[PDB]
A paper describes a structure:
The protein kinase Akt is a central signaling molecule within the PI3K/Akt/mTOR-pathway, and dysregulation and malfunction of this pathway is a major cause of human diseases such as cancer and diabetes. For the protein kinase Akt, three isoforms are encoded in the human genome sharing a high overall sequence homology, particularly within the conserved kinase and the pleckstrin homology (PH) domains. Recently, we utilized a class of covalent-allosteric Akt inhibitors (CAAIs) to achieve isoform-selectivity. These types of ligands alkylate one of two cysteine residues within an interdomain pocket between the regulatory PH and the catalytic kinase domain, leading to an irreversible stabilization of the inactive conformation bearing a structurally blocked ATP-binding site.
For a greater understanding of the binding mode of the synthesized ligands, we co-crystallized two [name]-selective pyridine derivatives with full-length [name]. The complex structures depict a similar binding mode and show that both ligands stabilize the full-length protein in the autoinhibited conformation with the PH domain folded onto the kinase domain (PH-in conformation). Through this intramolecular contact between the N- and the C-lobe, the regulatory helix αC is displaced, shaping an allosteric binding pocket at the interface. The kinase is stabilized in a DFG-out conformation. Due to missing interactions with adenosine or an equivalent moiety, the hinge region is slightly shifted. The relatively small biarylic part of the molecule is stabilized by π–π-stacking with Trp80 and Tyr272. Additional hydrophobic interactions can be observed between the phenyl ring in the 3-position and Leu210, Leu264, and Ile290. On the other hand, the complex with CAAI 3 highlighted a more flexible residue at the benzylic position of the pyridine core, which is close to Lys268. In both structures, the data suggested that the covalent inhibitors can label Cys310 and Cys296. Further structural proof was provided through co-crystallization of [name] with potent CAAIs 3 and 6, which revealed covalent bond formation to the addressed cysteine residues.
Author numbering: 4 to 44, 48 to 112, 144 to 186, 205 to 301, 308 to 444
Write the structure that this text describes.
Amino acid sequence: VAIVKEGWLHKRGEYIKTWRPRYFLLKNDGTFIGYKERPQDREAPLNNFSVAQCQLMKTERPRPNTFIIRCLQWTTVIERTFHVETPEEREEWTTAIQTVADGLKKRVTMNEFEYLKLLGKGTFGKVILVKEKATGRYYAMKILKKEVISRHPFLTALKYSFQTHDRLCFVMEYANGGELFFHLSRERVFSEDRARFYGAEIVSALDYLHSEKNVVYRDLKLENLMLDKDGHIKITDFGLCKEGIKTFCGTPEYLAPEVLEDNDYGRAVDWWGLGVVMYEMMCGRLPFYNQDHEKLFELILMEEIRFPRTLGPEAKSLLSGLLKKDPKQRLGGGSEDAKEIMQHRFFAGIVWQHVYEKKLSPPFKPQVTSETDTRYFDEEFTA
Ligand SMILES: CCC(=O)Nc1ccc2[nH]c(=O)n(C3CCN(Cc4ccc(-c5ncc(CO)cc5-c5ccccc5)cc4)CC3)c2c1
């Protein structure tokens, strides 16, 4: 359980596509971690950084002496692009990485679904809204290029996985209670009670992913939250890695500081996201927002988060801890992880086993008759 290789690499930023020097550790457990400076040295390894079941590619574009680690994590293809000064070093890194990966080695068809809407396109495939002909139920289908290659109440479940000759297809449930940004904008702001409920269920799902699955979600934002027919949260998994837009990938309003800086990150990234999401629910606006990306980054990195006079002291305490710039200081960034949030005064009185078991009654019931009611898909209502 030790280091197989370490040294400086040039890593391309995941959201700001610039080259940055980072000190990377390769460990026999499969973790490939990069730090801004050489670390003096959470202990539970995170699969986000694992090299297990990845393929290594050597390329001379966009830059010479580049190598790429490509991994399928759950239903998303992930790439990490690195550059070294010499081809001899690139060969050292790839073989070392490859050896570690080798050491860790030890019907339904497309015709059953009706294509409805394109939800998103990515470098390695697309996501479409479909309806199973037999049931009338709605699903998101991730169609990924084959060439490139459990269950929780509040995560969108992966139901079917099947293949074509050139595509790999993941079929996951699509909640029909409406997008959470659609509900928040309609009602402007949520009461602290209502935000506590959605917040509680998110904490429950994040606790599962961190403890049981040892994975950081890293994508927690309002756009990835939906309500099912009963009004419970569903965190979505409809994402696909895209080439940036000239070059920044997506929008940064929700990104944790340590993620923006391409620095070492862990489970604390999701608590930031929780803070971003709960700040907007209870305040009616994003914490940091400015059109200049140079300013948005500074705002996220530098500007101290401000609160409205309407927020209670408990809510202000929770948001302040969640939105601490430094993850080591952030609420939930310690070894207790999710327990720090659960035991917070803002969640006093919440029985956390009742949360996992959907015992808490939703404060808002979406106006749908069943799991197949298409109200929140209808154009007339969505506007
Ligand atoms: C600018 C555009 C772009 O390209 N962004 C980008 C680039 C590189 C990335 N590398 C990166 O890891 N992510 C990130 C990679 C993907 N996460 C999203 C994610 C993270 C974990 C699971 C997940 N897992 C395991 C289990 C069970 O076992 C269950 C789930 C699950 C299921 C249902 C709902 C919720 C979670 C599912 C999605 C967040 C993003 C990257 C993103």
